[PDB]
Design a protein around this ligand. Structure first.
Ligand SMILES: [Mg+2]
Ligand SMILES: [Zn+2]
Ligand SMILES: [Zn+2]
Lengths: 107, 84, 1415, 134
């Protein structure tokens, strides 16, 4: 995780895919000032395991498709360090229920 | 391929839709001269006789409740609770 | 349905594999040779040749001859032909991908320029989307416009790959209507990329290569995008509409085929014979023209190619494009059989579910009943009456299907009917029909009634159904549709019946109310003051259709047997009903006859009106439907109307000019109220003239006066009408109307009896349409009350000529915006419903569609049927943590907290028990658990939430259906109560699942209801408050259980269509510290707008300092964008060649100060405004250092300080500088930010009234500071010390989701829509919007409710073509060999099939086994 | 009378309260082919071509017209035109299916070409109904 003041060279950031499988995450200081996630508007986002994700599709009878998909750039999907495929169990609240289980697949 | 009769997340109650189509298919068939599985107790309107059929729960219809994934579950008119 | 049997097996249309016609196949698939444009007749000799018509296609003139198929005219589907084109032609629309593929494929070898050696091309080849695989390949290969003979490998660069041959350059392809234009370069040679040359390359293209593009070697190849074989459409597509007999009648399509046929044999002449080459390209380009013309004429290619009539010629594109263009007016919409349109009239005698049907309409509309022994005999009477006597028959269909047209048959009286026959009998008394009042924007707009064959030519209807249909008896025109299938009339009677939709699922309230005469009569009767005498009473009691024939005890039997207006109304009200209302002026003794108390279908006190007999959530209407029944309550609408109106007929009512006149001095007092405010007008008028006006924040001085002058004129406009409002006695016939609510409002009284007021267009108080004056009858510069459009007169007094003209312009606006928004709203309905079409509720108890893509994992985040839900109250959130303790905590260890043996039979022994208090601990602790839970979901305290199963009503019924005497103690044990709920809590189910998640999101779903369950059925409240038995308690638990499992949403319910049909419907009714007022605001959010008409960022103060006035006083100028332009009066340039000495005397000493304690000859001096500076609070040193650090080391600053009155900042720099210094001042003012974040303008202060739980638990009011601003750029405005970077909200929903996750996006979008529901105050249950809000979210971001949001995604080729773009959408279905699921609505719609909607979802079969049992 | 409607005194309509009239005209010509072939204005009956309308031709005289004053019914012929082709096709014009009434004026002139022009009138007495607009 690189925490730069202004930016990084595009000459340098091409050295990000360079060391696989290890993933290199890049965040500017700017959005880190305030905790983007600790907001009123955003509910919990949970990194769901290989087995947790499979179980979701096996019980809720879904497909890699059918799922309500999530952005990769979602300030959450980078705060959690999410990668493509990962499931995000979201516990939002309801005006007519109290809690409801929503699931997103990262792109 | 389907799913068995044990393993049913499908509401054990008949849907207002299933009521309308059973009571309708019996309305069609009964007006279509079809056999009447209830005693015609003063009843002569096809659609009406079909209603006193769901009462005596002696309708031979079975509902194929398809799951949007692909597979399905079966329920007879007797099998469905009518709290409609 | 087709006519005449065929041994061919019948079936569904399960797939529609779209593709292209192989010019190879076109030929084979042809019966006709099509060679000449001599159409029909062989030289006027009435026949047809091997030409345009029947060279083997299908004959006209009621004849067979259709190449062996013959089958007359009906049952004869058209038979296609062919025509070989003299040179290949660019298929008009596929001309797109023709240019495109050409920029990817090497125009030499037929191989993609780029391949598996370029990493992003590899990235593209991998994309599993058929046209997005193209999307990247196109963007990629168009670039490298030279194919590589050799290129380096992915391993080492000195190591090359000879992959594919040819190193020849690609052209720069650009359109020219019918021929492409290349380009290669010394000097640019542009090649005429001709059809023949182009097609060739396309043939060569590697299978794998067109496969890596949007193509297919089975359904649609790119080599078929260019036509050599044109299929000749049969005549039932291009008819022969002959005049009498010896006259032509060919459709304009037959013309353009003839005009191609000419153009084919023209190119043949030049080709086959003497070649003219650069003259052959004319007959080629005209064939190329007419083949592109006959398909599309209405294109970008300027000539619409008008036929000699000036007609563009009926393009096969224009024949399929939107509304009445096949798809949207002949397929999605149709003109149907068994229909009737008639004028409407009111009725006080028909039941809610009955329809007025004139004799003639009943005699014109037929139903086919099947000759069965049940009917038969009576059908045989119908059969000997025909169509003259009301009950008769039009036709009699044999077992064979031969129409015995009763009307003219010779055996018409004989008719010996056999079974299995069908007698077409008239539609008659108490039969089912779909009655409808256009537009059909509501589920409720198209409902089913009961025929009641009346005389007199009008469609009559019950007056309570005047509201759900959008009715007004001003001669409204309504439709009627006669079902034929005994299955179809089962479909009306079970889901479409009027008694069913009494309760509106759309907003969880009933949508049928008692109106006008019944709305005023019932209130005029339900008074303490009104009574009736025996003779008239007996008529009233008899008038109830289902009256017991029991004479009720007259409340007064003293010197007259008298019956109160309420004791007779109680008769219609069904015994068992419970309704408690209460208001301000209610005290159970209700001096003001206020509130409403109806214990067991009998009135106690209160006055019946809108709050009871009106279409409201609490209203008697709603209560009776849930508490008694639907075809039970719809009876009650009738019972009441019949009786209230019988009394109204005899009491009488009238409204005349007598009502518009207020008592003598009140009318004088009115012109005192307008006069005192007219004095409050001149105050501001005199204040503004001498510039003493304290202009507010974000307000012009011109605006400041107008905004305030309007305030006092309208403050007095309101209180002027108020005078006459209560001055007009209890007797005022107009007051009486509005009293019940029947029709009218206070504003009416105001504009009729006191004063009209201010008239305005675009909000602007009628301004100076002339030179500074209002009208030519006015003085130049008159901002006066009457001048800018104020009316002091009431409609009664009569308006002045001026007071009348100003009333015209202000009214003018109220006619335009009607036409505008009623039409825009129309498009807004369309979009919502075409997007949310496919979407419904399924068997997994999930929300899916046309594929299976999930929206919600439980419908409505809860899983209930929209209307079953009544606004329930959560008692657990409320009170201080001490009030809660008294009401709920049971402590059978302490003497002062034990339920006394006056409450339960165990009360004296249940005390001091270990495990019994241990039990109760879970009870109170689970309530404290529930307390903060509900205090987390809603931190605004409010308990009045939409919750299914009215728990109140069940106990209400229990207390009077069990006659529980709160005298003796309840039988129950503490063990009975706590645990009795703990078991009920389980049997309340949504997702019936047996696993992990299905059990989990289930607990989640019924959490809130369970918190309400725990609030009412809590041990203390149960025995202390309720005193209910085990028997009653068990009834309370029992009735809640099944009432809840009824509340489960029914799998099939078109939840999507319904969400839209509850949004789109009340959007129409919208008549619209400054945003966009509902209607334009909606089109911003629905269309997803980033270019917001009113962008606004709202910041709450930093957690701690809520009420700190000074905190917002710092953040304000620290967030508000200040420019050098703001603080500067004038920027001048002098010529001061010396660095030290300044020739300026107004600066002569200023220098000598900030100097003592190489440089530019050109001086840049600029004067500042002291107020404008000491407005954002400034220093010359602030400004000075700001600019210093802007330009830095290349420009040096000197200035005069705040002490010095000449507010100057002098500046210089380090051959040519007159222009260069003049250049600087441009960037200086506009770009030099001085204070606050950019874009974020008018920073205004608000003392936002908050809601915080007090130090004692009490939910209390907290006045806190909030900075509301006219500026949006959150990106950094969030990173501020003085704000709550949790409460910080903005109008730009885009800017929310951008910086704070996608699940907060769903949020900003929802909040932004609910505050559009309040834009006309009206309600819509959370579920309808929360579905649409989830539609533009479940994608992964934000999507518009347009042809580039929902209509461009995943859904089948037909579900998308059904809206906005058609021919177009269907064209990419062809070339990219697309497929239709046949899974959505639109899919089955086209095919005329039973779609998987509600009744169509599940399939029904017969078990030989269950079938054999019965006998 | 609720939600804007209104009751009416028929015993007053009977005298002349909102009693009105309505008059409809009908147009047709003796259309020429040039080679001195004109459509015939008379009462055609089957014979040679039989391409005729279904209404009552029986009411019209032998100048291919009803004289004014006769009670017209619904779909009955008012204009009798025969179409000669190379006999009795037919292009007769009848009463508008919806309407009813009595013939008012039967006008016949010559056009700028001198083609037998017809102008028939249908005089109906429109009386206040149970759903008429006022
Ligand atoms: Mg209207
Ligand atoms: Zn045929
Ligand atoms: Zn090549």
């Amino acid at each position: 995780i690189f925490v730069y003041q202004n930016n990084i060279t595009p000459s340098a950031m091409k050295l990000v895919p360079s060391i696989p499988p290890a993933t290199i995450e890049t965040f500017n200081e700017a959005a880190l000032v305030v905790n983007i996630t600790h907001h009123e508007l955003v509910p919990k986002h949970i990194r769901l395991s290989s087995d947790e994700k499979r179980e979701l599709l096996k019980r809720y009878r879904l497909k890699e498709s059918q799922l309500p998909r999530i952005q990769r750039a979602d300030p959450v999907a980078l705060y959690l360090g999410l990668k493509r495929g990962e499931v995000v169990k979201i516990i939002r609240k309801s005006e007519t229920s109290g809690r409801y289980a929503s699931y997103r697949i990262c792109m | 391929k389907a799913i068995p009769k044990d393993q049913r997340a499908t509401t054990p109650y008949m849907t207002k839709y299933e009521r309308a189509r059973i009571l309708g298919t019996r309305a069609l068939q009964i007006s279509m001269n079809a056999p009447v599985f209830v005693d015609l107790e003063g009843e002569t309107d096809p659609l009406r006789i079909a209603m006193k059929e769901l009462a005596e729960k002696k309708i031979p219809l079975v509902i194929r409740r398809y799951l949007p994934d692909g597979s399905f579950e079966d329920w007879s008119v007797e099998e469905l609770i009518v709290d409609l | 349905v087709g006519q005449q049997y065929s041994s061919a097996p019948l079936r569904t249309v399960k797939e529609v594999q779209f593709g292209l016609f192989s010019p190879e196949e076109v030929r084979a698939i042809s019966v006709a040779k099509i060679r000449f444009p001599e159409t029909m007749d062989e030289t006027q000799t009435r026949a047809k040749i091997g030409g345009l018509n029947d060279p083997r296609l299908g004959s006209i003139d009621r004849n067979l001859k259709c190449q062996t198929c013959q089958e007359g005219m009906n049952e004869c589907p058209g038979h296609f032909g062919h025509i070989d084109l003299a040179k290949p032609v660019f298929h008009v629309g596929f001309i797109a991908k023709i240019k495109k593929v050409c920029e990817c494929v090497c125009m030499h070898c037929g191989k993609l320029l780029l391949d598996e050696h370029n990493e992003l091309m590899r990235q593209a080849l991998a994309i599993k989307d058929s046209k997005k695989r193209f999307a990247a390949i196109w963007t990629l290969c168009k670039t490298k416009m030279v194919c590589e003979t050799d290129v380096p490998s992915e391993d080492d660069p000195t190591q090359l790959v000879s992959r594919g041959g040819c190193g020849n350059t690609q052209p720069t392809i650009r359109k020219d209507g019918l021929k492409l234009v290349g380009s290669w370069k010394d000097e640019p040679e542009l090649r005429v990329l001709s059809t023949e040359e182009i097609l060739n390359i396309f043939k060569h293209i590697s299978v794998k290569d067109f496969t890596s593009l949007g193509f297919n070697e089975v359904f649609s190849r790119p080599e078929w995008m260019i036509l050599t074989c044109l299929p000749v459409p049969p005549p039932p597509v291009r008819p022969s509409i002959s005049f009498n007999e010896s006259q032509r009648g060919e459709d304009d399509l037959t013309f353009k085929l003839a005009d191609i046929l000419k153009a084919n044999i023209s190119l043949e002449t030049l080709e086959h014979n003497g070649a003219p080459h650069h003259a052959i390209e004319e007959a080629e380009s005209l064939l190329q023209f007419h083949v592109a013309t006959y398909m599309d004429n209405d294109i970008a290619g300027q000539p619409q190619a008008l036929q000699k009539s000036g007609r563009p010629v009926k393009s096969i594109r224009a024949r399929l494009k939107g509304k009445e263009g096949r798809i949207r007016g002949n397929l999605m919409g149709k003109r149907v059989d068994f229909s009737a349109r008639t004028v409407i009239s009111g009725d006080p005698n028909l039941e809610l579910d009955q329809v007025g049907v004139p004799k003639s309409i009943a005699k014109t509309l037929t139903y086919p009943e099947v000759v069965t022994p049940y009917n038969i005999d009576r059908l045989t009477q119908l059969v000997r009456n025909g169509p003259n006597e009301h009950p008769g028959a039009k036709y009699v269909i044999r077992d064979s299907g031969d129409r015995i047209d009763l009307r003219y048959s010779k055996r018409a009286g004989d008719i010996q009917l056999q079974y299995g026959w069908k007698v077409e009998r008239h539609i008659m008394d108490n039969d089912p029909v779909l009655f409808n009042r256009q537009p059909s924007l509501h589920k409720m707009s198209m409902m089913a009634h009961r025929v009641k064959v009346i005389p007199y030519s009008t469609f009559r209807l019950n007056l309570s159904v005047t509201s759900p249909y959008n009715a007004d008896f001003d001669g409204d025109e309504m439709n009627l549709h006669v079902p034929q299938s005994e299955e179809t009339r089962a479909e009306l009677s079970q889901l479409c019946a009027v008694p069913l939709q009494i309760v509106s699922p759309q907003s969880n309230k009933p949508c049928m109310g008692i109106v006008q005469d019944t709305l005023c009569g019932i209130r005029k009767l339900t008074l303490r003051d009104t009574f009736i005498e025996l003779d008239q009473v007996l008529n009233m009691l008899y008038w109830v259709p289902d009256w017991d024939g029991v004479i009720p005890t007259p409340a007064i039997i003293k010197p007259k047997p008298l019956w109160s207006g309420k004791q007779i109304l109680s008769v219609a009200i069904p015994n068992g009903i419970h309704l408690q209302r209460f208001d301000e002026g209610t005290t159970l003794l209700s001096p003001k006859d206020n509130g409403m108390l109806i214990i067991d279908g009998q009135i106690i006190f209160g006055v019946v009106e809108k709050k009871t007999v009106g279409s409201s959530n609490g209203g008697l209407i709603h209560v009776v439907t849930r508490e008694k029944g639907p075809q039970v309550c719809a009876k009650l609408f009738g019972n009441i109307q019949k009786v209230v109106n019988f009394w109204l007929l005899h009491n009488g009512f009238s409204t005349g000019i007598g009502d518009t006149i207020a008592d003598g001095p009140t009318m004088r007092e009115i012109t005192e109220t307008i006069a005192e405010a007219k004095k409050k007008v001149l105050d501001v008028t005199k204040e503004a003239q001498a510039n003493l006006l304290t202009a507010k924040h974000g307000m012009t001085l011109r605006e400041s006066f107008e905004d305030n002058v309007v305030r006092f004129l309208n403050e007095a406009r309101d209180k002027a009408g108020r005078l006459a409002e209560v001055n007009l006695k209890d007797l005022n016939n107009v007051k009486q109307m509005v009293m019940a609510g029947s029709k009218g409002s206070f504003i009416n009284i105001a504009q009729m009896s006191a004063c009209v007021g201010q008239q305005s267009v675009e909000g602007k108080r009628i301004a100076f349409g002339f030179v500074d004056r209002t009208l030519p009858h006015f003085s130049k510069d008159d901002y006066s009350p009457e001048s800018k459009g104020f009316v002091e007169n009431s409609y009664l007094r009569g308006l002045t000529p001026q007071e009348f003209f100003f009333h015209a312009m202000g009214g003018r606006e109220g006619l335009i915006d009607t036409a505008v928004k009623t039409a825009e709203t129309g498009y807004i309905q369309r979009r919502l419903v075409k997007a949310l079409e496919d979407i419904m509720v399924h068997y997994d108890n999930t929300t899916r569609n046309s594929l299976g893509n999930v929206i919600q994992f439980i419908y409505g985040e809860d899983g209930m049927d929209a209307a079953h839900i009544e606004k329930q109250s959560l008692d657990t959130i409320g009170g201080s943590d001490a009030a809660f303790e008294k009401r709920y905590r049971v402590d059978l260890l302490n003497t002062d907290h034990t339920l006394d043996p006056s409450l339960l039979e165990s009360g004296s022994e249940i005390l001091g028990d270990l495990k019994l208090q241990v039990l109760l601990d879970e009870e109170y602790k689970q309530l404290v658990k529930d307390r903060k839970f509900l205090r987390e979901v809603f931190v605004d305290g409010e308990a009045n939430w939409p919750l299914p199963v009215n728990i109140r009503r069940i106990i209400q019924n229990a207390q009077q259906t069990f006659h529980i005497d709160h005298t003796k103690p309840s039988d129950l044990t503490i063990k009975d109560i706590v645990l009795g709920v703990k078991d009920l809590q389980e049997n309340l189910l949504v997702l019936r699942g047996k696993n992990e998640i299905i059990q989990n999101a289930q607990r989640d779903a019924v959490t809130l209801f369970c918190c309400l369950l725990r609030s009412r059925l809590a041990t203390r409240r149960v025995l202390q408050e309720y005193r209910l038995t085990k028997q009653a308690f068990d009834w309370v638990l029992s009735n809640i259980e099944a009432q809840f499992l009824r509340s489960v949403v029914h799998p099939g319910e078109m939840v999507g269509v319904l969400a839209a049909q509850s949004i789109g419907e009340p959007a129409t009714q919208m008549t619209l510290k400054k945003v966009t007022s509902g209607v334009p605001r909606l089109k911003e959010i629905l269309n997803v707008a980033k270019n917001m008409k009113t962008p606004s960022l709202t910041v709450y103060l930093e957690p701690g300092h809520a009420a700190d006035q000074e905190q917002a006083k710092l953040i304000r100028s620290a967030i508000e964008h200040t420019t050098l332009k703001s603080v500067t009066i004038a920027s001048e340039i002098y010529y001061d060649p010396d660095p030290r000495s300044t020739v300026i005397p107004e600066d002569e000493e200023i220098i000598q100060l900030h100097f003592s304690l190489q440089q530019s000859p050109w001086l840049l001096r600029l004067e500042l405004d002291r107020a404008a500076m000491n407005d954002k609070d400034l220093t010359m040193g602030q400004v000075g250092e700001r600019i210093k650090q802007t330009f830095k080391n290349d420009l040096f600053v000197i200035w005069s300080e705040d002490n010095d009155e000449k507010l100057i900042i002098r500046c210089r720099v380090v051959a040519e500088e007159d222009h260069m210094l003049k250049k600087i001042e441009n960037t200086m003012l506009e770009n030099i930010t001085l204070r606050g974040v950019e874009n974020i303008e008018r920073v205004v202060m608000m003392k936002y009234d908050r809601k915080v739980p007090s130090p004692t638990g009490e939910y209390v009011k907290e006045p806190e500071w909030v900075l509301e601003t006219d500026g949006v750029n959150l990106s950094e405005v969030m990173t501020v010390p003085g704000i709550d970077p949790t409460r910080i909200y903005t109008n730009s929903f885009i800017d929310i989701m951008e910086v704070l996750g996608i699940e907060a996006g769903r949020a900003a979008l929802y909040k932004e829509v609910y505050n559009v529901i309040a834009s006309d105050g009206s309600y819509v249950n959370y579920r309808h919007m929360a579905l649409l809000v989830d539609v533009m979210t479940t994608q992964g971001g934000l999507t518009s409710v347009t042809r580039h949001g929902f209509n461009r995604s995943n859904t089948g080729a037909l579900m998308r073509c059904s809206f906005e773009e058609t021919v177009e959408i269907l064209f990419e279905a062809g070339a990219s060999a697309e497929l239709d699921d046949c899974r959505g609505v639109s899919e089955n719609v086209i095919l005329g099939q039973m779609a998987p909607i509600g009744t169509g979802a599940f399939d029904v079969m017969i078990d030989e086994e269950s079938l054999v049992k019965y006998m | 009378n609720q939600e804007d409607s209104m009751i009416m005194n028929q015993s007053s309509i009977d005298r002349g309260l909102f009693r009105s009239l309505f008059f409809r005209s009908y147009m047709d010509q003796e259309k020429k082919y040039g080679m001195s072939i004109t459509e015939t204005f008379e009462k055609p009956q089957r014979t040679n071509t039989l391409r005729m309308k279904h209404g009552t031709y029986d009411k019209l005289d032998d100048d291919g017209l009803i004289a004014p004053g006769v009670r017209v019914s619904g779909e009955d012929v008012i204009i009798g035109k025969t179409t000669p082709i190379s006999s009795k096709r037919d292009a007769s014009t009848p009463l508008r299916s919806t309407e009813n009434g009595i013939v008012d004026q039967v006008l016949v002139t010559t056009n700028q070409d001198g083609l037998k022009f017809v102008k028939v009138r249908v005089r109906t007495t429109k009386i206040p109904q149970i759903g008429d607009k006022f």
